[PDB]
């Protein structure tokens, strides 16, 4: 198989005055004198694809005439999963009412470590409020590296303003993001019927979120396994 | 038609240094020395289309110059139906309150088998909860092979958290997926007015879901037949 | 004006080793030896363009060198209307509570026939339930041939499950479809405040839908006339 | 600057057998014998752009070799505004409860004429019901010529059917249209809490809509001025 | 590195009769006689990309043969952020109930000046009402120059018409805009449960918006810092 001098997206394409198309791939600049390669290189650059420069000399500023396009490159793609039995999960948590989302996250991580035992790694991403979750989830989904995304928050009616608009927007936005990027997004954003901060609700919801974390961990594991199964 | 050596999507396109464009179709690598075929092959690869390799020699690494493009290839297309009087249906069921979705599914399958008698086959897909249904439906619709998709769940107000957000998101997402992929999606996700788990509701909803399964089977058959009719 | 051997979408394009983009248009296969025509034919095929093969010989397998592209071909386009003072309307009706949608449809057809007197033709399409209307409307709008689409249903709260989710989904889906395809869609899907099946509601809603049919007929005629007016 | 024989969208492109690409622009047919211009003309036609045919002879059927592409042509573009201090506004009004929308429209027009004094022209468009406003707004926004669009209606709960579905659909559709076409759309569709047709409500809402018309006029003027300001 | 005669979007492309492709970049007109550059220049123009004309002579009407395409140009892109530790924020405020949004804005600006001390600059944009916020936010997001966008309004039930439709539309449209343009948009649009203008509510909501401004300032700083962090 031919040597891969550099693989990655074209950082910049420069058509020099000597009929050479200089393209920078994976931090290394390569140029080609082929007339047919110039429109192909331009199309590759404008399509957001990753090309692999192939030549006998892999040094900077070396000519090349061999290149491979697997399937419209990689670009922002190559996501929607990492590997079976070894993947990663992103846990986005809001910092409003942190003392309960913390319990949910601790239960989730503990259960995942108990079952998988190191096969699954969970990364924690902090976020100011429930409204900021859909965009963060979209970014983490398009970046790849993740087989599932979990978002946790505690949306509370404070008795002054109405809270249902933000909850509806967040739920619908998470659904839209997961449909757009084809990465599962599990919802642990919960809106109680009543919460008047009487320390009885405070004691109750700690344990209830402790249970919800384990439930979400099991759901995430099973959905990732099933999605990997039906793709074969 | 010419001898079809291999038909399928271009797994990878490799432009070698000898002015040859090597493309792998249906697991077999083929190369062209034609200058005009290279931009056409690149466009075919970037457009997500399937080409048909036509040549006298069908062995690996054999050159070819004949290719046929039916209609922008197949790619992710060729779905939205399998065949009249012989097709498949995907039954996505949630595992929350399984004892009732099970009754609905059994009624659906029994009625299907009663009328069609083996003409329609039902494949069964499990899912953690109602929130995971739209993405599974989108995947199964884009994969083709299915003339209709059925999603069943039982969304319950548990008395602690509000449940209407998830139900609204699920219904709207199922409709959006159905409009996006042009594959009918029938909804058997139901939200009762009251359910307090007093075994009276438990005994009632078993039979009611038993009825709903037969109703959904009839609706699926009729809608598939009508959609096949108006397309001629 | 040059003779039209065949006009329509390219059924299949076959670039043989002979470097000839053999193309089947309107059920007739035509081939060209022009080098410049091959990329143009490929672009037309991938863009869903309808080409008109023009040559002195219109028989199958005859060479051609003349072709006309009016405006990106026709493809799935040429819809959003048929002709002024002579067009068609699609009436999609649900089969749930058929005894009332029947009254609405009869009123609509009778009023149309009374005013236009044969200038407007109404085609009836059957559908199992309200949830299956938006996709049927999208298909009938994309197929062309129709200046307006009418969808009728009777969404009823049965006292067991909640019904507002499906009604909201249907209304929003019809609006989305009519915005997408630029074909007016008139809504005759109605949700009464109360309906307990006491034969008083049954007697009342027959006449009320009888009125609604005439109202919808007048609205459809007015909107089609106005839309045809502002487009000049 | 070179003479403009004809400027507009390519009505039809015809590649004759004499290696000439005949294109009709602004009602005049022009042909070119340049080999390089043919793919460029095809791309211009398929991209929905307007080209300006330039030649020493501007008569029909005259050869040309000069053409200018400003920015992907005009096509459906050139909208989202007409000119500062002199623009147009489209007033779409529903014919349901006309006696109140009439007061709103009269107030709007009178206030516009009082402040601008002929600098702003208001065009009136009639529509059978509130459900048919968003598509009309989308058409009038895509056609250009308008810096703002106003939609007025009176959505009323009649006591028989539920009315909130249509109102929600209309508001969301108007917002979606204004986001899609980048033309401001001001909402004067109003849903009162109670209206039982007791002639007290009828007398009150006349004056209230009279006030709302002036309010909408001021809002439209200020938003158009601000949008024109931030674009420099 | 080669001299930059002019960098920017192609204002207009003019293919003269002398086989020269004149392109205006950054207010300066440049022409090239290269046959291969003409399709590349046309593709660059139609793709909405910015090219950098490079030649030994940078004067108007000077020939060039060198050009660089970094990554599909800039065009409407280059947004979603300005720089770390030194960026800008757009504060869109509605003029309905200005005496409270003013308090919110003053708190926001004061807190940002207290912490950053001149590192972050806030620009104030006026808007007639809550309905006009999402489109303004979309414009300011697409123009670039901003790492975050804040929208403030006070949606009030006046006791005559229903207000929840507009609030829902505004929240959903703001979330849709922030997902479309990948620029965070923080919500300070608030809908109180009750507000009867008895000057007790007027005194209370002044201080409450004073608090909400500081809260939004902290949330904006945190979200910008985190988004800049995860992008490395």
UniProtKB/Swiss-Prot annotation, chains A, B, C, D, E:
Its EC number is 2.5.1.78. GO terms for biological process: riboflavin biosynthetic process. It is found in: Cytoplasm. Its main location: cytoplasm. The active site is at 162 (proton donor). GO terms for molecular function: 6,7-dimethyl-8-ribityllumazine synthase activity. It holds the Pfam family DMRL_synthase. Keywords: Cytoplasm, Riboflavin biosynthesis, Transferase. Pathway: Cofactor biosynthesis; riboflavin biosynthesis; riboflavin from 2-hydroxy-3-oxobutyl phosphate and 5-amino-6-(D-ribitylamino)uracil: step 1/2. It catalyses: (2S)-2-hydroxy-3-oxobutyl phosphate + 5-amino-6-(D-ribitylamino)uracil = 6,7-dimethyl-8-(1-D-ribityl)lumazine + phosphate + 2 H2O + H(+). It comes from the Bacteria. Disulfide bonds: none annotated. It is an enzyme of class 2 (transferase). (2S)-2-hydroxy-3-oxobutyl phosphate binds at residue 201. Could be useful as a specific antigen for the serological diagnosis of active infection of both human and bovine brucellosis. Has been used as a protein carrier of foreign peptides and proteins. The described characteristics of BLS make this protein an ideal antigen carrier for vaccine development. Induction: The two ribH genes may be differentially expressed during the Brucella infection cycle. Brucella would use RibH1 for flavin biosynthesis during the extracellular phase and RibH2 during intracellular growth. GO terms for cellular component: cytosol; riboflavin synthase complex. 5-amino-6-(D-ribitylamino)uracil binds at residues 96, 130-132, 154-156, 187. Belongs to the DMRL synthase family. Homodecamer, arranged as a dimer of pentamers. Catalyzes the formation of 6,7-dimethyl-8-ribityllumazine by condensation of 5-amino-6-(D-ribitylamino)uracil with 3,4-dihydroxy-2-butanone 4-phosphate. This is the penultimate step in the biosynthesis of riboflavin. Displays low catalytic activity in comparison with the isozyme RibH1. Is a highly immunogenic protein. Activates dendritic cells (DCs) in vitro, increasing the levels of costimulatory molecules and the secretion of pro-inflammatory cytokines, and recruits DCs, B cells and CD8+ T cells in vivo, both effects in a TLR4-dependent manner. PANTHER family: 6,7-DIMETHYL-8-RIBITYLLUMAZINE SYNTHASE (PTHR21058:SF0), 6,7-DIMETHYL-8-RIBITYLLUMAZINE SYNTHASE DMRL SYNTHASE LUMAZINE SYNTHASE (PTHR21058). This is 6,7-dimethyl-8-ribityllumazine synthase 2.
């Amino acid at each position: 198989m031919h040597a891969d001098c550099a693989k990655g997206k074209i950082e910049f394409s420069k058509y020099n005055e000597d009929d050479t198309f200089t393209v920078k791939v994976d931090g290394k600049e390569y140029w080609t004198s082929r007339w047919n390669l110039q429109p192909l290189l331009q199309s590759a650059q404008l399509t957001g694809m990753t090309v692999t420069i192939k030549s006998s000399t892999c040094e900077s500023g070396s000519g090349f005439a061999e290149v491979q396009f697997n399937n419209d490159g990689s670009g922002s793609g190559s996501g929607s999963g990492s590997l079976k039995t070894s993947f990663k999960i992103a846990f986005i948590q809001a910092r409003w009412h942190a003392d309960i989302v913390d319990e949910a996250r601790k239960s989730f991580v503990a259960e995942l470590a108990a079952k998988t035992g190191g096969s699954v790694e969970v990364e924690i991403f902090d976020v100011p409020g429930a409204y900021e979750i859909p965009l963060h989830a979209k970014t983490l989904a398009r970046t790849g590296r993740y087989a599932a995304i979990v978002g946790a928050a505690f949306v509370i009616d404070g008795g002054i303003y109405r809270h249902d608009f933000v909850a509806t927007a967040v739920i619908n936005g998470m659904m839209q993001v997961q449909l757009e990027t084809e990465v599962p997004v599990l919802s642990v954003v919960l809106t109680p019927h009543h919460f008047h901060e009487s320390k009885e609700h405070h004691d109750f919801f700690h344990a209830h979120f402790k249970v919800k974390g384990v439930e979400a961990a099991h759901a995430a594991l099973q959905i990732v396994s099933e999605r990997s199964r039906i793709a074969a």
